[PDB]
RNA sequence: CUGCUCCUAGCAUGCUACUACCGCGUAGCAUUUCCCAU
């Protein structure tokens, strides 16, 4: 996985970094996950709001849907300090497990395990070419 | 790298309307020709 520096505008001097990923990983992941990703993105009115536009009243629709029958409603929001740099890998394994639960008939047990192993080997923990070294 | 949006251009399709000609089909109107031997 190649490492690179970003070029944009923000409000603090801390640097930014994108990561280039090999291409075989991309083809395999697309063929494996694309249908579920599209199904998630298209659906409206759910707990996850990925793929919903803030224009044409979508923002109001979301703000109403979250406003369900709450007896003494309040609003609370939190933050994750360094979410990506401090993620425990057990939860990442379990997350990649949840997404695969839909593959009930398309894939066998051994095939599922090998796909999970590939995902862990390619994205979770592997060799990061930074600078000119590994 | 994913999602959202704008704009432009092209294509292609579908549908609608208009114009022309054609022939058809129908209807009406009206005419023109009018025939002979082995
Ligand atoms: Zn499968």
Curated annotation (Swiss-Prot):
It catalyses: RNA(n) + a ribonucleoside 5'-triphosphate = RNA(n+1) + diphosphate; a 5'-end diphospho-ribonucleoside in mRNA + GTP + H(+) = a 5'-end (5'-triphosphoguanosine)-ribonucleoside in mRNA + diphosphate. Zn(2+) 10 binds at residues 103, 106-107. The chain holds residues 4932 to 5065 of 7096 of the full protein. This is RNA-directed RNA polymerase nsp12. Interacts with nsp7 and nsp8 to form the replication-transcription complex (RTC): nsp12, nsp7, two subunits of nsp8, and up to two subunits of nsp13. Interacts with nsp9. Its cofactor is Mg(2+). Residues 82-134 are annotated as: RdRp Fingers C-ter. The lineage of its organism: Viruses, Riboviria, Orthornavirae, Pisuviricota, Pisoniviricetes. Residues 6-16 are annotated as: Interaction with RMP Remdesivir. RNA-directed RNA polymerase that catalyzes the transcription of viral genomic and subgenomic RNAs. Acts in complex with nsp7 and nsp8 to transcribe both the minus and positive strands of genomic RNA. The kinase-like NiRAN domain of NSP12 attaches one or more nucleotides to the amino terminus of NSP9, forming a covalent RNA-protein intermediate that serves as transcription/replication primer.
């Amino acid at each position: 996985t190649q490492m690179n520096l970003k070029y944009a505008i923000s409000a603090k001097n801390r640097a930014r970094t994108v990561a280039g990923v090999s291409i075989c990983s991309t083809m395999t992941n697309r063929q494996f996950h694309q249908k579920l990703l599209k199904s998630i993105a298209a659906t409206r009115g759910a707990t996850v709001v990925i793929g919903t536009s803030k224009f044409y009243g979508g923002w109001h629709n979301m703000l109403k849907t979250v406003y369900s029958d709450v007896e003494n409603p309040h609003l609370m929001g939190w933050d994750y300090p360094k979410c990506d740099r401090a993620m425990p890998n057990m939860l990442r394994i379990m997350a990649s497990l949840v997404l695969a639960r839909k593959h009930t008939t398309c894939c066998s047990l051994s095939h599922r395990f090998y796909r999970l192993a590939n995902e862990c080997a390619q994205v979770l923990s592997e060799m990061v070419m930074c600078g000119g070294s590994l």
